[PDB]
Amino acid sequence: MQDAITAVINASDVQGKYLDTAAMEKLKAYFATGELRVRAASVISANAANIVKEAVAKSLLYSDITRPGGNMYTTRRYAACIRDLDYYLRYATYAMLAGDPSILDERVLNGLKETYNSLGVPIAATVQAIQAMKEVTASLVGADAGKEMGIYFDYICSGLS
Amino acid sequence: MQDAITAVINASDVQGKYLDTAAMEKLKAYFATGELRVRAASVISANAANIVKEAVAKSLLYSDITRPGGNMYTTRRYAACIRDLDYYLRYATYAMLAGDPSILDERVLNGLKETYNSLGVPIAATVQAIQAMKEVTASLVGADAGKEMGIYFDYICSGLS
Amino acid sequence: MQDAITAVINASDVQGKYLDTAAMEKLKAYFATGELRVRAASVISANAANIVKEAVAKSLLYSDITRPGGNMYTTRRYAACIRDLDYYLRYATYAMLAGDPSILDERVLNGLKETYNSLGVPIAATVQAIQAMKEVTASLVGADAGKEMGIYFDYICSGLS
Amino acid sequence: SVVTKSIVNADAEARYLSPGELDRIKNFVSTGERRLRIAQTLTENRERIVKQAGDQLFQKRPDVVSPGGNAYGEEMTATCLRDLDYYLRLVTYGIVAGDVTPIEEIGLVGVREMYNSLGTPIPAVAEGIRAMKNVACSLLSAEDAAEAGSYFDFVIGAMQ
Amino acid sequence: SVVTKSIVNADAEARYLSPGELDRIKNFVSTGERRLRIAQTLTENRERIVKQAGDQLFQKRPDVVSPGGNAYGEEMTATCLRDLDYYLRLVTYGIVAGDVTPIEEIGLVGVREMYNSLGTPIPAVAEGIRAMKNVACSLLSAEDAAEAGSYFDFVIGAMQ
Amino acid sequence: SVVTKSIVNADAEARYLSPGELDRIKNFVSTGERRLRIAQTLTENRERIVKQAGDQLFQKRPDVVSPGGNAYGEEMTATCLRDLDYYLRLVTYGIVAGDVTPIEEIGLVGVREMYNSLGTPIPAVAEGIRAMKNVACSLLSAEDAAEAGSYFDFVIGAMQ
Ligand SMILES: *[C@H](C)[C@H]1/C(=C/c2[nH]c(/C=C3N=C(/C=C4\NC(=O)C(CC)=C4C)C(C)=C\3CCC(=O)O)c(CCC(=O)O)c2C)NC(=O)[C@@H]1C
Ligand SMILES: *[C@H](C)[C@H]1/C(=C/c2[nH]c(/C=C3N=C(/C=C4\NC(=O)C(CC)=C4C)C(C)=C\3CCC(=O)O)c(CCC(=O)O)c2C)NC(=O)[C@@H]1C
Ligand SMILES: *[C@H](C)[C@H]1/C(=C/c2[nH]c(/C=C3N=C(/C=C4\NC(=O)C(CC)=C4C)C(C)=C\3CCC(=O)O)c(CCC(=O)O)c2C)NC(=O)[C@@H]1C
Ligand SMILES: *[C@H](C)[C@H]1/C(=C/c2[nH]c(/C=C3N=C(/C=C4\NC(=O)C(CC)=C4C)C(C)=C\3CCC(=O)O)c(CCC(=O)O)c2C)NC(=O)[C@@H]1C
Ligand SMILES: *[C@H](C)[C@H]1/C(=C/c2[nH]c(/C=C3N=C(/C=C4\NC(=O)C(CC)=C4C)C(C)=C\3CCC(=O)O)c(CCC(=O)O)c2C)NC(=O)[C@@H]1C
Ligand SMILES: *[C@H](C)[C@H]1/C(=C/c2[nH]c(/C=C3N=C(/C=C4\NC(=O)C(CC)=C4C)C(C)=C\3CCC(=O)O)c(CCC(=O)O)c2C)NC(=O)[C@@H]1C
């Protein structure tokens, strides 16, 4: 995978150039916002179970998907769904903490849409759950940290669609 | 896999309804014909080697496929062919005993046509062998048990084509 | 895999005929040229490292591929490239020694073009390297042995394109 | 079912069903009529079993229907009686199937992951199906109450 | 062949053929002319070997050509002489190949699965190729009979 | 980087970053400004470091630039100074990354396979980067020379 630092290094590596005056400023932008990223990660780690709980109750619960015939129906498929929200929340935190969505492309979104369309999982319902967590996470981490997380929340939703 | 009983349960499960008055009659139909299915399975198990032998001699033997250039030629491909008839006869007995062709879709027909077309096995010749076993099995098990087996024999042939 | 001897046997096997008067001459052609094939293999085995070295310096080195941005750039991708030339030279020697390009189709060219196009390896640059080894090998093994090797060198290049 | 289990075990070893395994299908089909009558009795008395089991459940565990509990209010209490209806519907499938696989696959596999996320006390849910067992078995005969009760006990044990 | 075997073993360890393995190809190509003459001698005297081997086979095992046996009748007996012709054709490939791989891959791999299904006695089939060995080797010289006979023995051993 | 390593280790065990692992990112981002100044100092004095390191390298190993050696001639010697420029460029990435992964992935993984094929003496290449270390560290402060020098030592150790 890549992060904000190594992504800039690889960009200069392919060109065969040293770290430019513009390239140094991109790193300084990441270092200056380093403590803000770490502060948000600790809050989400503490409220990991609560963010997923509120997101499911807001968007998913009390609807056709939870009822017989729906995809969330049965304890196996219900437990399998909240497990995905636990991944999406955890992998979104890595993308924010790293400052690069390379981890989402490799270890999450790679062949994810094809796996759902095969099994029969609704993508539209999954997006609403992730978008629900974006609003719930933003209230806890704040406006500054909430926006940065939202970039990688929307990146996961973009990969599914 | 599924059988006649669990298939009816899953049908009522997706609707989210209890066992209907019509659904109970489908189960009673399976239970009433339970001893007839078991009687046929024991006969085919005893005459497992003979049914495959007569079917091959009737349809496959003394023809281009057994001669050099054909697909049954060589002891490896000959032994590999009778092995398939041993599967088709065994998996057809499971489908009859279960009363549902779900086992044929999962553990037999799944990617079977693609495997033959790759290796170069003739599908038309394979169907005649299975249809040969249908006539041979029907004479042993009887008219009542022979028809029920024939449904799942024709189901395998339908999957190949 | 197959060689010059077993390839002729399989040709007569599918027809269901004994070794024909014409088929015997094909074997005698291989046996008469047997010592010439073995002599060439020992020369290439001794000069295995030198043939790959000169071929890379002639075609690959000092160009865009070795420079930053190119596919040979970095020690990992450089070492991975010379490793391929070590395979192509070794597998070409097997094809010459066997007298049949069946080994190239099975254990080399099978899904090779798809693997490169995925990773992003240039096929045009790879062909020039193999064609470079053909000229270098021909000078060592001689005119008689050099032509026979060239058939299987060009066969690998044909498989990539 | 026993028919499904016998085929899966036979297919695993690559062989036709043994004389013993065929006999497990012989008695299964003969005693099928008995289990259907047991399933119908619970199905006919479906609304009564859920109501009485709920009343006994909330008597033994008032904290769930008290302020702060999971089943506080009319909607939250009504949703709990639906859970009881689900497991009662699964028990009827388990009975007619002759084993606890339909109960397991549907409403037990990953059941604690569901209720822990919802915040429902699972020992309270286990105490709920205890109430259904006693109310359901009272309608059935002495022999049928013993058979049907084993499926309820499996649902209790899975939750614990 | 020895050339194929040397390449497969060399490719397995990721290396060029050793001086010893190259020498196994050197003598193989030199003695190739010798084995072709042995193959031609059996090919020219093909019809005679099959007829005499059959006559000796049915003398030692009359039950196969007697009523109830597998080779009873003109068509069934003629089909048995074809089997002998097949293995004689495979022996000629084995000789010219320098090893028993062509014999193994074609007519030996899963040979008992074939004959047990057909109902043919395989020890009778093994006794048939014993007859071919003695009739085939009698045509060849003392040195060639020893070489060609080792391929027949392999076909006998595989059936047993 | 330490951020990448902390995420990879956390993702492996299926868990959020621990308080300790988060602290490794806290100090990393605070000391990021320090390492950027070290990277700039080497970048500004890029041409001087390569020239002086080359002069010292050829003094200690004259055989490489003598007739018969790998770096004999103006073009071959100029290509050797580019190799030094590459590893100096990799060192600056290693410094700003906070670890030797950028140095490892690019110019060290399969480095001996490259130079053995080219015919370059790798201990001579290791002696070249020793010269860069001493020339580069002399420009930096006492504290920065200790930090930057550890990345040079890693490149030396990988070649040996
Ligand atoms: C009653 C004994 C206990 C109780 C239960 C309770 N449940 C809910 C909400 C839900 N329960 C389920 C249950 C299932 N879904 C399934 O697919 C299966 C297997 C077939 C079962 C058993 C579901 C899906 C929900 C979500 C609602 C929906 O259907 O969409 C609540 C409400 C929780 C809340 O606050 O929202 C309660 C209270 N409550 C108790 O106190 C008892 C311990
Ligand atoms: C929840 C919001 C939605 C939902 C999901 C659901 N998923 C499955 C089955 C699987 N889901 C995954 C997902 C992941 N695997 C990963 O490795 C990662 C991170 C890299 C994710 C997010 C996988 C692998 C499976 C298959 C495993 C399995 O045991 O099935 C189901 C069950 C589908 C089935 O029939 O098996 C469901 C229901 N369901 C919803 O309704 C929401 C829209
Ligand atoms: C003779 C020594 C024994 C014998 C043989 C016998 N064979 C058959 C029928 C067949 N035999 C074969 C044999 C082969 N097929 C192959 O591909 C190979 C490898 C190259 C071999 C050796 C085959 C294919 C048949 C089927 C006929 C066909 O060709 O389509 C019979 C007839 C059996 C019957 O009753 O139909 C017999 C009798 N019989 C003996 O008694 C000897 C022991
Ligand atoms: C016989 C009626 C026909 C025939 C068949 C034949 N099959 C093969 C090779 C394979 N056949 C299978 C079949 C199955 N695999 C299964 O798991 C099941 C049940 C679930 C079946 C029915 C498989 C897996 C193979 C590949 C294995 C292998 O060792 O090859 C061949 C040989 C093809 C080849 O060249 O390898 C043949 C000849 N041949 C006929 O002529 C009949 C029409
Ligand atoms: C100098 C300390 C030593 C030395 C070096 C030398 N190198 C070459 C030729 C090449 N060196 C490289 C090196 C790299 N490529 C990479 O991708 C990386 C990682 C980023 C490195 C370090 C390459 C690619 C070449 C090929 C030329 C090209 O760029 O295309 C030579 C020339 C060899 C020849 O004879 O052609 C030399 C001499 N020489 C010494 O004496 C020192 C020990
Ligand atoms: C050299 C002439 C060209 C070149 C090659 C290059 N290849 C790779 C990566 C791989 N190459 C192979 C090749 C083979 N695998 C085999 O098994 C055989 C013989 C049967 C061959 C010839 C494989 C399997 C890989 C993947 C393994 C890996 O570790 O990557 C690369 C690296 C690509 C990457 O980004 O990973 C390169 C650069 N490069 C050139 O520029 C020449 C045109």
PDB file of N, CA and C in Angstrom, chain D residues 2-66:
ATOM      1  N   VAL D   2     -32.794 -35.632   7.771  1.00  0.00           N
ATOM      2  CA  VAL D   2     -32.015 -36.870   7.856  1.00  0.00           C
ATOM      3  C   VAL D   2     -31.663 -37.386   6.456  1.00  0.00           C
ATOM      4  N   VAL D   3     -32.555 -37.145   5.497  1.00  0.00           N
ATOM      5  CA  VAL D   3     -32.315 -37.507   4.100  1.00  0.00           C
ATOM      6  C   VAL D   3     -31.156 -36.693   3.520  1.00  0.00           C
ATOM      7  N   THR D   4     -31.130 -35.397   3.824  1.00  0.00           N
ATOM      8  CA  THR D   4     -30.051 -34.514   3.376  1.00  0.00           C
ATOM      9  C   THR D   4     -28.721 -34.885   4.031  1.00  0.00           C
ATOM     10  N   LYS D   5     -28.756 -35.146   5.336  1.00  0.00           N
ATOM     11  CA  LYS D   5     -27.560 -35.530   6.090  1.00  0.00           C
ATOM     12  C   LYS D   5     -26.977 -36.865   5.626  1.00  0.00           C
ATOM     13  N   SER D   6     -27.851 -37.815   5.299  1.00  0.00           N
ATOM     14  CA  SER D   6     -27.424 -39.132   4.824  1.00  0.00           C
ATOM     15  C   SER D   6     -26.761 -39.056   3.446  1.00  0.00           C
ATOM     16  N   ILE D   7     -27.272 -38.176   2.586  1.00  0.00           N
ATOM     17  CA  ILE D   7     -26.705 -37.973   1.250  1.00  0.00           C
ATOM     18  C   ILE D   7     -25.359 -37.244   1.312  1.00  0.00           C
ATOM     19  N   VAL D   8     -25.267 -36.233   2.175  1.00  0.00           N
ATOM     20  CA  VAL D   8     -24.034 -35.454   2.335  1.00  0.00           C
ATOM     21  C   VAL D   8     -22.885 -36.317   2.864  1.00  0.00           C
ATOM     22  N   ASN D   9     -23.178 -37.155   3.856  1.00  0.00           N
ATOM     23  CA  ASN D   9     -22.185 -38.074   4.416  1.00  0.00           C
ATOM     24  C   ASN D   9     -21.792 -39.177   3.432  1.00  0.00           C
ATOM     25  N   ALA D  10     -22.763 -39.652   2.653  1.00  0.00           N
ATOM     26  CA  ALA D  10     -22.519 -40.678   1.638  1.00  0.00           C
ATOM     27  C   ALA D  10     -21.709 -40.127   0.465  1.00  0.00           C
ATOM     28  N   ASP D  11     -22.028 -38.901   0.052  1.00  0.00           N
ATOM     29  CA  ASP D  11     -21.314 -38.233  -1.040  1.00  0.00           C
ATOM     30  C   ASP D  11     -19.874 -37.885  -0.651  1.00  0.00           C
ATOM     31  N   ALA D  12     -19.655 -37.595   0.631  1.00  0.00           N
ATOM     32  CA  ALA D  12     -18.323 -37.259   1.140  1.00  0.00           C
ATOM     33  C   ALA D  12     -17.336 -38.414   0.973  1.00  0.00           C
ATOM     34  N   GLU D  13     -17.786 -39.630   1.280  1.00  0.00           N
ATOM     35  CA  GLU D  13     -16.948 -40.826   1.163  1.00  0.00           C
ATOM     36  C   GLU D  13     -17.023 -41.482  -0.223  1.00  0.00           C
ATOM     37  N   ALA D  14     -17.832 -40.911  -1.119  1.00  0.00           N
ATOM     38  CA  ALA D  14     -17.993 -41.421  -2.483  1.00  0.00           C
ATOM     39  C   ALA D  14     -18.589 -42.829  -2.485  1.00  0.00           C
ATOM     40  N   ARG D  15     -19.843 -42.928  -2.054  1.00  0.00           N
ATOM     41  CA  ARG D  15     -20.530 -44.215  -1.950  1.00  0.00           C
ATOM     42  C   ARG D  15     -22.044 -44.043  -1.842  1.00  0.00           C
ATOM     43  N   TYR D  16     -22.779 -45.092  -2.204  1.00  0.00           N
ATOM     44  CA  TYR D  16     -24.233 -45.116  -2.043  1.00  0.00           C
ATOM     45  C   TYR D  16     -24.589 -45.249  -0.566  1.00  0.00           C
ATOM     46  N   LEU D  17     -25.802 -44.833  -0.207  1.00  0.00           N
ATOM     47  CA  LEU D  17     -26.248 -44.870   1.188  1.00  0.00           C
ATOM     48  C   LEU D  17     -26.253 -46.300   1.726  1.00  0.00           C
ATOM     49  N   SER D  18     -25.741 -46.470   2.943  1.00  0.00           N
ATOM     50  CA  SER D  18     -25.648 -47.786   3.573  1.00  0.00           C
ATOM     51  C   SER D  18     -27.026 -48.269   4.030  1.00  0.00           C
ATOM     52  N   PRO D  19     -27.186 -49.595   4.227  1.00  0.00           N
ATOM     53  CA  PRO D  19     -28.447 -50.152   4.730  1.00  0.00           C
ATOM     54  C   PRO D  19     -28.959 -49.471   6.002  1.00  0.00           C
ATOM     55  N   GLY D  20     -28.041 -49.074   6.881  1.00  0.00           N
ATOM     56  CA  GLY D  20     -28.390 -48.337   8.093  1.00  0.00           C
ATOM     57  C   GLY D  20     -28.890 -46.934   7.798  1.00  0.00           C
ATOM     58  N   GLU D  21     -28.191 -46.230   6.908  1.00  0.00           N
ATOM     59  CA  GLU D  21     -28.567 -44.864   6.524  1.00  0.00           C
ATOM     60  C   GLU D  21     -29.896 -44.812   5.767  1.00  0.00           C
ATOM     61  N   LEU D  22     -30.169 -45.839   4.966  1.00  0.00           N
ATOM     62  CA  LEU D  22     -31.458 -45.963   4.283  1.00  0.00           C
ATOM     63  C   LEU D  22     -32.590 -46.204   5.284  1.00  0.00           C
ATOM     64  N   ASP D  23     -32.285 -46.923   6.363  1.00  0.00           N
ATOM     65  CA  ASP D  23     -33.262 -47.204   7.419  1.00  0.00           C
ATOM     66  C   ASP D  23     -33.607 -45.935   8.210  1.00  0.00           C
ATOM     67  N   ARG D  24     -32.655 -45.006   8.304  1.00  0.00           N
ATOM     68  CA  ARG D  24     -32.900 -43.703   8.932  1.00  0.00           C
ATOM     69  C   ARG D  24     -33.860 -42.836   8.114  1.00  0.00           C
ATOM     70  N   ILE D  25     -33.971 -43.121   6.817  1.00  0.00           N
ATOM     71  CA  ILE D  25     -34.948 -42.460   5.951  1.00  0.00           C
ATOM     72  C   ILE D  25     -36.291 -43.198   5.990  1.00  0.00           C
ATOM     73  N   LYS D  26     -36.245 -44.519   6.176  1.00  0.00           N
ATOM     74  CA  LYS D  26     -37.458 -45.341   6.256  1.00  0.00           C
ATOM     75  C   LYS D  26     -38.343 -44.959   7.442  1.00  0.00           C
ATOM     76  N   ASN D  27     -37.746 -44.848   8.628  1.00  0.00           N
ATOM     77  CA  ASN D  27     -38.496 -44.454   9.823  1.00  0.00           C
ATOM     78  C   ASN D  27     -38.866 -42.967   9.800  1.00  0.00           C
ATOM     79  N   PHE D  28     -38.015 -42.157   9.170  1.00  0.00           N
ATOM     80  CA  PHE D  28     -38.247 -40.717   9.029  1.00  0.00           C
ATOM     81  C   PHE D  28     -39.520 -40.417   8.236  1.00  0.00           C
ATOM     82  N   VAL D  29     -39.725 -41.142   7.140  1.00  0.00           N
ATOM     83  CA  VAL D  29     -40.905 -40.943   6.294  1.00  0.00           C
ATOM     84  C   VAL D  29     -42.178 -41.514   6.926  1.00  0.00           C
ATOM     85  N   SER D  30     -42.033 -42.570   7.727  1.00  0.00           N
ATOM     86  CA  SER D  30     -43.168 -43.172   8.431  1.00  0.00           C
ATOM     87  C   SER D  30     -43.638 -42.288   9.586  1.00  0.00           C
ATOM     88  N   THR D  31     -42.685 -41.725  10.329  1.00  0.00           N
ATOM     89  CA  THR D  31     -42.993 -40.829  11.449  1.00  0.00           C
ATOM     90  C   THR D  31     -43.161 -39.365  11.014  1.00  0.00           C
ATOM     91  N   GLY D  32     -43.183 -39.118   9.704  1.00  0.00           N
ATOM     92  CA  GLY D  32     -43.402 -37.775   9.166  1.00  0.00           C
ATOM     93  C   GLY D  32     -44.799 -37.245   9.431  1.00  0.00           C
ATOM     94  N   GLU D  33     -45.794 -38.127   9.350  1.00  0.00           N
ATOM     95  CA  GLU D  33     -47.189 -37.762   9.612  1.00  0.00           C
ATOM     96  C   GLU D  33     -47.392 -37.305  11.058  1.00  0.00           C
ATOM     97  N   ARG D  34     -46.657 -37.919  11.983  1.00  0.00           N
ATOM     98  CA  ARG D  34     -46.731 -37.575  13.403  1.00  0.00           C
ATOM     99  C   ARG D  34     -46.237 -36.153  13.667  1.00  0.00           C
ATOM    100  N   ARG D  35     -45.110 -35.796  13.056  1.00  0.00           N
ATOM    101  CA  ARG D  35     -44.491 -34.484  13.265  1.00  0.00           C
ATOM    102  C   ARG D  35     -45.272 -33.344  12.604  1.00  0.00           C
ATOM    103  N   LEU D  36     -45.986 -33.650  11.522  1.00  0.00           N
ATOM    104  CA  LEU D  36     -46.834 -32.662  10.851  1.00  0.00           C
ATOM    105  C   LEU D  36     -48.015 -32.250  11.732  1.00  0.00           C
ATOM    106  N   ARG D  37     -48.580 -33.214  12.460  1.00  0.00           N
ATOM    107  CA  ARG D  37     -49.657 -32.939  13.415  1.00  0.00           C
ATOM    108  C   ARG D  37     -49.170 -32.057  14.565  1.00  0.00           C
ATOM    109  N   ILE D  38     -47.929 -32.281  14.995  1.00  0.00           N
ATOM    110  CA  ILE D  38     -47.301 -31.464  16.034  1.00  0.00           C
ATOM    111  C   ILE D  38     -47.054 -30.039  15.535  1.00  0.00           C
ATOM    112  N   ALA D  39     -46.635 -29.917  14.277  1.00  0.00           N
ATOM    113  CA  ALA D  39     -46.394 -28.612  13.657  1.00  0.00           C
ATOM    114  C   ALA D  39     -47.687 -27.812  13.492  1.00  0.00           C
ATOM    115  N   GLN D  40     -48.765 -28.494  13.110  1.00  0.00           N
ATOM    116  CA  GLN D  40     -50.073 -27.854  12.935  1.00  0.00           C
ATOM    117  C   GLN D  40     -50.654 -27.342  14.253  1.00  0.00           C
ATOM    118  N   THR D  41     -50.481 -28.115  15.323  1.00  0.00           N
ATOM    119  CA  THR D  41     -50.992 -27.746  16.647  1.00  0.00           C
ATOM    120  C   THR D  41     -50.373 -26.441  17.151  1.00  0.00           C
ATOM    121  N   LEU D  42     -49.075 -26.271  16.914  1.00  0.00           N
ATOM    122  CA  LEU D  42     -48.374 -25.036  17.269  1.00  0.00           C
ATOM    123  C   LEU D  42     -48.762 -23.885  16.339  1.00  0.00           C
ATOM    124  N   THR D  43     -49.014 -24.206  15.070  1.00  0.00           N
ATOM    125  CA  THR D  43     -49.404 -23.209  14.071  1.00  0.00           C
ATOM    126  C   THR D  43     -50.812 -22.662  14.325  1.00  0.00           C
ATOM    127  N   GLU D  44     -51.739 -23.544  14.691  1.00  0.00           N
ATOM    128  CA  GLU D  44     -53.109 -23.135  15.020  1.00  0.00           C
ATOM    129  C   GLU D  44     -53.145 -22.271  16.279  1.00  0.00           C
ATOM    130  N   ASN D  45     -52.397 -22.689  17.299  1.00  0.00           N
ATOM    131  CA  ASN D  45     -52.300 -21.951  18.559  1.00  0.00           C
ATOM    132  C   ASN D  45     -51.032 -21.099  18.573  1.00  0.00           C
ATOM    133  N   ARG D  46     -50.917 -20.229  17.574  1.00  0.00           N
ATOM    134  CA  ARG D  46     -49.722 -19.415  17.359  1.00  0.00           C
ATOM    135  C   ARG D  46     -49.787 -18.108  18.149  1.00  0.00           C
ATOM    136  N   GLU D  47     -50.924 -17.424  18.062  1.00  0.00           N
ATOM    137  CA  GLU D  47     -51.114 -16.129  18.719  1.00  0.00           C
ATOM    138  C   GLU D  47     -51.171 -16.257  20.244  1.00  0.00           C
ATOM    139  N   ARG D  48     -51.778 -17.339  20.726  1.00  0.00           N
ATOM    140  CA  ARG D  48     -51.900 -17.593  22.165  1.00  0.00           C
ATOM    141  C   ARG D  48     -50.547 -17.897  22.813  1.00  0.00           C
ATOM    142  N   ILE D  49     -49.737 -18.720  22.150  1.00  0.00           N
ATOM    143  CA  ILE D  49     -48.411 -19.088  22.658  1.00  0.00           C
ATOM    144  C   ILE D  49     -47.496 -17.869  22.814  1.00  0.00           C
ATOM    145  N   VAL D  50     -47.523 -16.975  21.827  1.00  0.00           N
ATOM    146  CA  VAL D  50     -46.680 -15.777  21.840  1.00  0.00           C
ATOM    147  C   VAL D  50     -47.110 -14.786  22.927  1.00  0.00           C
ATOM    148  N   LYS D  51     -48.420 -14.641  23.118  1.00  0.00           N
ATOM    149  CA  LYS D  51     -48.963 -13.712  24.112  1.00  0.00           C
ATOM    150  C   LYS D  51     -48.653 -14.165  25.539  1.00  0.00           C
ATOM    151  N   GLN D  52     -48.938 -15.433  25.833  1.00  0.00           N
ATOM    152  CA  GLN D  52     -48.701 -15.993  27.166  1.00  0.00           C
ATOM    153  C   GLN D  52     -47.213 -16.081  27.502  1.00  0.00           C
ATOM    154  N   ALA D  53     -46.399 -16.451  26.514  1.00  0.00           N
ATOM    155  CA  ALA D  53     -44.947 -16.520  26.690  1.00  0.00           C
ATOM    156  C   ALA D  53     -44.355 -15.140  26.969  1.00  0.00           C
ATOM    157  N   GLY D  54     -44.913 -14.116  26.327  1.00  0.00           N
ATOM    158  CA  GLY D  54     -44.511 -12.733  26.572  1.00  0.00           C
ATOM    159  C   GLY D  54     -44.866 -12.275  27.975  1.00  0.00           C
ATOM    160  N   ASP D  55     -46.095 -12.568  28.399  1.00  0.00           N
ATOM    161  CA  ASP D  55     -46.570 -12.201  29.737  1.00  0.00           C
ATOM    162  C   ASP D  55     -45.715 -12.828  30.839  1.00  0.00           C
ATOM    163  N   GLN D  56     -45.338 -14.092  30.653  1.00  0.00           N
ATOM    164  CA  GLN D  56     -44.460 -14.788  31.598  1.00  0.00           C
ATOM    165  C   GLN D  56     -43.024 -14.263  31.537  1.00  0.00           C
ATOM    166  N   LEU D  57     -42.565 -13.919  30.335  1.00  0.00           N
ATOM    167  CA  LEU D  57     -41.209 -13.400  30.137  1.00  0.00           C
ATOM    168  C   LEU D  57     -41.007 -12.054  30.834  1.00  0.00           C
ATOM    169  N   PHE D  58     -41.976 -11.153  30.680  1.00  0.00           N
ATOM    170  CA  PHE D  58     -41.896  -9.822  31.288  1.00  0.00           C
ATOM    171  C   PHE D  58     -42.131  -9.866  32.800  1.00  0.00           C
ATOM    172  N   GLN D  59     -42.793 -10.919  33.275  1.00  0.00           N
ATOM    173  CA  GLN D  59     -42.976 -11.140  34.710  1.00  0.00           C
ATOM    174  C   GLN D  59     -41.650 -11.531  35.363  1.00  0.00           C
ATOM    175  N   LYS D  60     -40.915 -12.432  34.714  1.00  0.00           N
ATOM    176  CA  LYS D  60     -39.617 -12.889  35.213  1.00  0.00           C
ATOM    177  C   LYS D  60     -38.510 -11.854  34.987  1.00  0.00           C
ATOM    178  N   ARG D  61     -38.609 -11.100  33.891  1.00  0.00           N
ATOM    179  CA  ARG D  61     -37.657 -10.031  33.582  1.00  0.00           C
ATOM    180  C   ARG D  61     -38.397  -8.717  33.312  1.00  0.00           C
ATOM    181  N   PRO D  62     -38.762  -7.981  34.381  1.00  0.00           N
ATOM    182  CA  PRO D  62     -39.443  -6.693  34.214  1.00  0.00           C
ATOM    183  C   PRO D  62     -38.530  -5.564  33.727  1.00  0.00           C
ATOM    184  N   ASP D  63     -37.223  -5.698  33.951  1.00  0.00           N
ATOM    185  CA  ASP D  63     -36.256  -4.654  33.591  1.00  0.00           C
ATOM    186  C   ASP D  63     -36.216  -4.342  32.091  1.00  0.00           C
ATOM    187  N   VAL D  64     -36.514  -5.338  31.259  1.00  0.00           N
ATOM    188  CA  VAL D  64     -36.521  -5.156  29.804  1.00  0.00           C
ATOM    189  C   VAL D  64     -37.675  -4.263  29.338  1.00  0.00           C
ATOM    190  N   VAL D  65     -38.832  -4.393  29.987  1.00  0.00           N
ATOM    191  CA  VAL D  65     -40.008  -3.572  29.669  1.00  0.00           C
ATOM    192  C   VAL D  65     -40.147  -2.357  30.592  1.00  0.00           C
ATOM    193  N   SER D  66     -39.186  -2.176  31.498  1.00  0.00           N
ATOM    194  CA  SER D  66     -39.131  -0.994  32.358  1.00  0.00           C
ATOM    195  C   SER D  66     -38.314   0.101  31.670  1.00  0.00           C
TER     196      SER D  66
END
